[PDB]
Design an enzyme around this catalytic site. Sequence first.
Site, PDB file in Angstrom:
ATOM      1  CD  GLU A  89      11.672   8.408   0.008  1.00  0.00           C
ATOM      2  OE1 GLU A  89      12.744   7.963  -0.431  1.00  0.00           O
ATOM      3  OE2 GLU A  89      11.475   8.731   1.222  1.00  0.00           O
ATOM      4  CG  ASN A 136      16.883   2.490  -0.294  1.00  0.00           C
ATOM      5  OD1 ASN A 136      16.186   2.449   0.718  1.00  0.00           O
ATOM      6  ND2 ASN A 136      17.857   1.621  -0.561  1.00  0.00           N
ATOM      7  CB  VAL A 149      19.042   5.185   1.705  1.00  0.00           C
ATOM      8  CG1 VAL A 149      20.361   6.006   1.547  1.00  0.00           C
ATOM      9  CG2 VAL A 149      19.336   3.792   2.235  1.00  0.00           C
ATOM     10  CD  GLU A 191      15.343  11.160  -0.449  1.00  0.00           C
ATOM     11  OE1 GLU A 191      16.127  12.182  -0.595  1.00  0.00           O
ATOM     12  OE2 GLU A 191      15.749  10.014  -0.317  1.00  0.00           O
ATOM     13  CG  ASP A 193      -9.993   1.262  -1.599  1.00  0.00           C
ATOM     14  OD1 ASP A 193      -9.855   2.144  -0.700  1.00  0.00           O
ATOM     15  OD2 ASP A 193      -9.287   0.240  -1.713  1.00  0.00           O
ATOM     16  CG  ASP A 228      -1.478  -9.524  -8.207  1.00  0.00           C
ATOM     17  OD1 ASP A 228      -2.018  -8.435  -8.545  1.00  0.00           O
ATOM     18  OD2 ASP A 228      -2.115 -10.390  -7.540  1.00  0.00           O
ATOM     19  CB  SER A 229      -0.349  -4.800  -6.895  1.00  0.00           C
ATOM     20  OG  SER A 229      -1.695  -5.166  -6.921  1.00  0.00           O
ATOM     21  CD  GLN A 289       1.063  -4.992   3.562  1.00  0.00           C
ATOM     22  OE1 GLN A 289       2.307  -5.028   3.597  1.00  0.00           O
ATOM     23  NE2 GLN A 289       0.405  -3.946   4.018  1.00  0.00           N
ATOM     24  N   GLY A 290       1.214  -3.500   0.763  1.00  0.00           N
ATOM     25  CA  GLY A 290       2.159  -2.353   0.783  1.00  0.00           C
ATOM     26  C   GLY A 290       2.161  -1.569  -0.513  1.00  0.00           C
TER      27      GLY A 290
HETATM   28  N1  LIG Z   1      -2.719  -8.776  -5.308  1.00  0.00           N
HETATM   29  C1  LIG Z   1      -3.445  -7.454  -5.395  1.00  0.00           C
HETATM   30  C2  LIG Z   1      -3.386  -6.821  -4.005  1.00  0.00           C
HETATM   31  C3  LIG Z   1      -3.325  -5.473  -3.814  1.00  0.00           C
HETATM   32  S1  LIG Z   1      -3.142  -5.017  -2.199  1.00  0.00           S
HETATM   33  C4  LIG Z   1      -3.123  -6.643  -1.740  1.00  0.00           C
HETATM   34  C5  LIG Z   1      -2.958  -7.167  -0.373  1.00  0.00           C
HETATM   35  C6  LIG Z   1      -3.254  -6.474   0.775  1.00  0.00           C
HETATM   36  C7  LIG Z   1      -3.059  -7.248   1.967  1.00  0.00           C
HETATM   37  C8  LIG Z   1      -2.613  -8.509   1.756  1.00  0.00           C
HETATM   38  S2  LIG Z   1      -2.414  -8.768   0.073  1.00  0.00           S
HETATM   39  N2  LIG Z   1      -3.233  -7.421  -2.769  1.00  0.00           N
HETATM   40 CA   LIG Z   2      14.963   7.851   0.082  1.00  0.00          CA
END
Ligand SMILES: NCc1csc(-c2cccs2)n1
Ligand SMILES: [Ca+2]
Length: 223
Positions: free
Chosen positions: A52, A54, A57, A62, A84, A171-172, A174-175
């Site tokens: 993947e 996009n 699309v 893929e 986790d 940072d990382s 949500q998602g």
């Molecule tokens: N900022 C690190 C991080 C990794 S997954 C995550 C969140 C999950 C749900 C809301 S925010 N935050």
């Molecule tokens: Ca795609």
Amino acid sequence: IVGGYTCGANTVPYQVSLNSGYHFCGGSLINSQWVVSAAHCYKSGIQVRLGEDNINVVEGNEQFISASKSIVHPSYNSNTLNNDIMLIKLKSAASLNSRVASISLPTSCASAGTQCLISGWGNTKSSGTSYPDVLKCLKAPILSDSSCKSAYPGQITSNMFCAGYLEGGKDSCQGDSGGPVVCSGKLQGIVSWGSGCAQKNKPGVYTKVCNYVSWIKQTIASN
Ligand SMILES: NCc1csc(-c2cccs2)n1
Ligand SMILES: [Ca+2]
């Protein structure tokens, strides 16, 4: 990913999207049949989407393959997020090529200060919400154990590390959960949790993959 950059199509060839009607988590391809993700990404009815860029699309590289089995770590605790990590087996083997490739497991734990690549299709804003279509990337260092603990008193276990920027901004989010943290060509982390995204003194927290290599290998060997 907040404060990252567009990776470029298929430049992160081990990155997969977990789809249950929509993208909901990342993962990392570790051989032609198996994906590493976060245990908090478990659900039934997963389709693994490889190749993947996009995610809205069909662009031509893929591979979509349904999961046959999910295995959540034996000691996962969903309240503390200790352990986790989960494994997902594909119903058929992926075709491996330059744009769909497995990432090596670590042979030793990485140290604080090591540079890594974090990637995903998660939210790109630290206030509010905007989800990208194409894959985003962030270069970030692993932080010391001691700064990780001082950032999150009472919550960092030996199966977690922090990576990112105490100053905030990058940072990382949500998602991104379940996706890779790759350092020197090895999968050292899985996007796990934090407190918001890109806030000062609240770096991302990542599952410490080097602790799980013998569980991963023995699980694959028997499943
Ligand atoms: N900022 C690190 C991080 C990794 S997954 C995550 C969140 C999950 C749900 C809301 S925010 N935050
Ligand atoms: Ca795609």
